[PDB]
C-alpha cells in the first residue's frame, strides 16, 4: 500500500539531456494514474494502446518513466513511427508502443537570461536508434569522406550539440519536459497496481 513515487519524476528539480534520457524504474507500489491525468496542466498527455481513464484498473510487473528535455516543435517526435533528429538519434519509441507520452512547457525553469546551453542533443549518428536504445558516445562523427582521427575538423563534427533556451524564444524553441511511461508486463507477479 505504498504510493508510487510520481513526484520523484514529474516534480523533480532537474531533468536529463535528451541524448542521455533518464529511466526511473517503478515497482512494488500502488499507482493512481487519474491524479496525473487530472493535474490538468500538461500540454501533451497522449496514451497509446490504453486509456488513462481506465488505467487504474490494471496491473504490470514494472513501470518505466523515461524523462528528458527537448524543444517545443520536437514534442511531436515523441510518438510511435516518427522521424527527426530526436526520434532517429536521441530517443526512438517503437511502432507497437503501449504507454503514454506526457509533456509540459518548462520555459520558466529551463531558461536563464542570456541563454541556457546546458541541455544537449545528438545531431549525428551513423544509423538510427532501435526502440528505447541509448547513446552517449562522444566519438567524432565522420560526415565527409576523410578520416577524422578522433579530432574535430572540416566535415569531422562533434556528435553532440547545445540547445539555446532563452526566455524570449518562440514556442517551437521553448524548453519542454517530457516523461514517457512504458508498462512492462512480465511473466512474474504484478507489482504495480491501482485501487
Amino acid at each position, epitope marked *: 500500500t505504498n504510493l508510487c513515487p510520481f513526484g520523484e519524476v514529474f516534480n523533480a528539480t532537474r531533468f536529463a539531456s535528451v541524448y542521455a534520457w533518464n529511466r526511473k524504474r517503478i515497482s512494488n507500489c500502488v499507482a493512481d494514474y487519474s491524479v496525473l491525468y487530472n493535474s490538468a496542466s500538461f500540454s501533451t498527455f497522449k496514451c497509446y494502446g490504453v486509456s488513462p481513464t481506465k488505467l487504474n484498473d490494471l496491473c504490470f510487473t514494472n513501470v518505466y518513466a523515461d524523462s528528458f528535455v527537448i524543444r517545443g516543435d520536437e514534442v511531436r517526435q515523441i510518438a510511435p513511427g516518427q522521424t527527426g533528429k530526436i526520434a532517429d538519434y536521441n530517443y526512438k519509441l517503437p511502432d507497437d508502443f503501449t504507454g503514454c507520452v506526457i509533456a509540459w512547457n518548462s520555459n520558466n525553469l529551463d531558461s536563464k537570461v542570456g541563454g541556457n*546551453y546546458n541541455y544537449l542533443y545528438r545531431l549525428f549518428r551513423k544509423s538510427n536508434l532501435k526502440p528505447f536504445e541509448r547513446d552517449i558516445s562522444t566519438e567524432i562523427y565522420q560526415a565527409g569522406s576523410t578520416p577524422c582521427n578522433g*579530432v574535430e575538423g572540416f566535415n569531422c563534427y*562533434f556528435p553532440l550539440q*547545445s540547445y*539555446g533556451f532563452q526566455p524570449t524564444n518562440g514556442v517551437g524553441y521553448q524548453p519542454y519536459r517530457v516523461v514517457v511511461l512504458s508498462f512492462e508486463l512480465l511473466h512474474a507477479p504484478a507489482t504495480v497496481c491501482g485501487p
Partner: antibody
Amino acid sequence: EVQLVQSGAEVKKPGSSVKVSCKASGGTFSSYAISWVRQAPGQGLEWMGRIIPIFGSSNYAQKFQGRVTITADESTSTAYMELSSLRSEDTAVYYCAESPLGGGSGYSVSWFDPWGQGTLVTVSS
Amino acid sequence: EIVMTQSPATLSVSPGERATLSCRASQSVSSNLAWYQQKPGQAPRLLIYGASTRATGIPARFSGSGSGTEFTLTISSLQSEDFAVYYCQQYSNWPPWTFGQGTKVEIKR
C-alpha cells in the same frame, strides 16, 4: 553569475613547463566547454584547446598538439592548462573561457563568455 | 579555411561620434558571428553573438549587424569606456575558433 578566477603570474625558463588553473565560482562546470586562448604581446588571440568537463574529452589545435594538456576537476570545478617545452615565443597572456556547444556548427564550441581574468606567462633565458 | 579580415587597423574618433568597424569573412558564414571588446590591459568580454544579438549587460550604443560575408559593429554614441580593441569571430565553418586581426578604437587627440 558564473565568473572565472585564474592563477597568478608565472616566470619560467626555456624548456621548463607551466600549469595554469581556472576556477569557476559557479559551482558546476556543467556542459559548457572550457577553452584556453593565448594572446602574445601586441598580437591577436589564438585558441589553443578545449576540454568538456562532463565528458572528460579534450581537443587541441594542431600547432599545440603534444605540448598542451587541458584537464578538468569537477568536484572543485577547476580547469587546468599545462604547456611544456616553453620557448620565448610562448611569452603571452593565457585566458580561459566557457563556451556553449555549437548550435548546429558540428563543433564543440561557439562563442566565448565568460572570460578568465588572464594569466601572464613570461619565458626568458 | 575561413579567414576573417577586419578594417580599419585603427580608428581615431572623438567622443559622441559614430564609429563603424568592419569584419569580412572569406566564405559565407551565415549569421553566426561574435564581437568581443578588449579594453587595454583587460581580458576580452563578448559584446555580441549571432551577428546581431547583444550580450547580457552590454550597453545599448553597441549594435551588431550583417550576415553572409559582410558584418559591421556600430558604436553610435561613443563614450569613454569604449576605447579598446575589438575582435570578430565566426563560429560556423571550420575552424570555428579563428579570430579577426582586431581593430583599435582610440581617442582622437
